[PDB]
Amino acid sequence: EIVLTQSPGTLSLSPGERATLSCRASQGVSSFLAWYQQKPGQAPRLLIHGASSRATGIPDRFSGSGSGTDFTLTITRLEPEDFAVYYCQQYGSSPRTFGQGTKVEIKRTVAAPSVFIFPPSDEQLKSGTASVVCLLNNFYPREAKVQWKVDNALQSGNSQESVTEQDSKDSTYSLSSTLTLSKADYEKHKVYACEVTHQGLSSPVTKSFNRGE
Amino acid sequence: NLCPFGEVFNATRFASVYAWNRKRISNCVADYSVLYNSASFSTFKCYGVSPTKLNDLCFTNVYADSFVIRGDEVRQIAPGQTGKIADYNYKLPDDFTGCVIAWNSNNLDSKVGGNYNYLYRLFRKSNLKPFERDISTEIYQAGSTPCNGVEGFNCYFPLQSYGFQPTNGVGYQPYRVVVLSFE
Amino acid sequence: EVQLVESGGGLIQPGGSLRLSCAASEFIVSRNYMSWVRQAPGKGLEWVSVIYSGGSTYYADSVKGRFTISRDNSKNTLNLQMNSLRAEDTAVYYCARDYGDYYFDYWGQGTLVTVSSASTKGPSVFPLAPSGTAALGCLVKDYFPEPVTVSWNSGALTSGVHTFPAVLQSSGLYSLSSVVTVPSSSLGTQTYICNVNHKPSNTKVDKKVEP
After folding, report:
1. CATH of segment(s) C4-115
2. Which three-class secondary structure state does DSSP give residue C15?
3. Which residues of C touch B87 (CB under 8 A)?
4. A33 lies in which domain range?
5. Is A93 within 8 Å of B72 when comparing Cβ atoms?
6. How buried is C188 (Cβ within 10 angstroms: 0-12 exposed, 13-18 middle, 19+ buried)?
7. Which of A56, A67, A93 sits opposite B171 (nearest CB)?
8. How far apart are CA C122 and CA C141, in angstroms?
9. With a CB-CB cutoff of 8 Å, which residues 109-138 of chain C face chain A?
């Protein structure tokens, strides 16, 4: 099968800027390439077909180019509703294959997160598990580091984090990290700390609490 | 009498696959050696006969069908195949007796900017019968709204063009096909 | 006006079978190329199967011998009969009209198919109590399968809310958090209640979050 490799993976631009997305085929597919747009939580939408023909109701700021193995999709003047994920799909040969997607996120100024730590509830401890939750609210860019510490022993392998989609009002991200312990392993320790490293912080911000309190 | 094979193979124009030509070969002597002894033929598949045993048999009528398709789609000109060409353009029966040959015709049938003379049927509501093919231009009703002869949304022209272009890979280049039927 | 509505998804055990349905509104599925395209959570797009306007059918190599595409003219329905389901096949399944077996111009909203040995379990909801501006939340833990819907004050509180996408923990269950930022001066006054709703288990929980 044809492998469609899209680049770049993530395309961080500001509204009004010019976007250029590339799609390469492992071998030639002539002009038999289509582009799709997908917003989070809803279905893909056809943008162009035939490498350069707009589908029905597609604004002229979308245009496609290329043939053989090289294709580009170009948004000329990015509207705020053009920030989504874009896939390429070939129908030249083999099974029809899709690209792995390019996200066009929104660029903005650096925003540091506000950090919140949450001790497990008393009701939850009654079930034998303890969840220590750490919240990183409204930051940009997306990449951030969350470090768990239990009595200054850096934890690892027992935490899971989760990031939101980019907020359509302030274009920031939020993150929650969850430290999962047994009720026994939780009550044999005192200090639980969440150390956050981000571009918007001069030094890593640490929040903590004492279990005995 | 020499059978008019040169009139079919070395023809100047070829038909579109949806409107492929048939020339009925009758009352002549056919030398199939000049055929299987040629380097031009990228495909020479025979069904029900041996290509070298051809000059030893007789038949009542020989049929020579000819058209142009992509290289990707020559694999459908065979008994028991499916695809937009076998299903909607040219269908061989499963008891087929004859030979299917093809050769690359890029330098003849493709041109810069695209060649839009060669068409194929893209929309048909039913599979073609073996040896039954239609020439129709009626637009295809894809919705429940009748089309009333106006090409629009859910009302599509049944044919597209190959747009053969000399620059594409081999699989997209035009190929001239001749099918010989024996009966 | 035109429409494609998938149905028939849900949770299924490995090795089991499932039948997907897709109702069409203006398109006559018997006159069109129809396709099924699936999308695993957080991965790309993968074509599954197509039925030609003349009856011909084709399948991706990963679902051959297991899936069977069909249609039903009396009800204008596209169907996908999935057998021997693996984990692997967990994805959102879309029906698309296929323009000439080339591209997919009209899609449906999709139906979610989950192939897991785990059992449908409702969520346990715990409070993330607050400690200017403050943050409070609900930890929606150990439910299966997705989706789950969270809202605050019967939907009357939407500004500052972040419901995080669920994470499958090593137990095989889903868990998420829903946080909301509020003024610190509203902690003594306003009542904050998260409205968790888990249809796949017919579970509905209101817990009030208080300091």
Report:
1. 2.60.40.10
2. coil
3. 52, 54, 56
4. 4-106
5. yes
6. exposed
7. A93
8. 9
9. 109-110, 124, 126-129, 131, 133, 135, 137
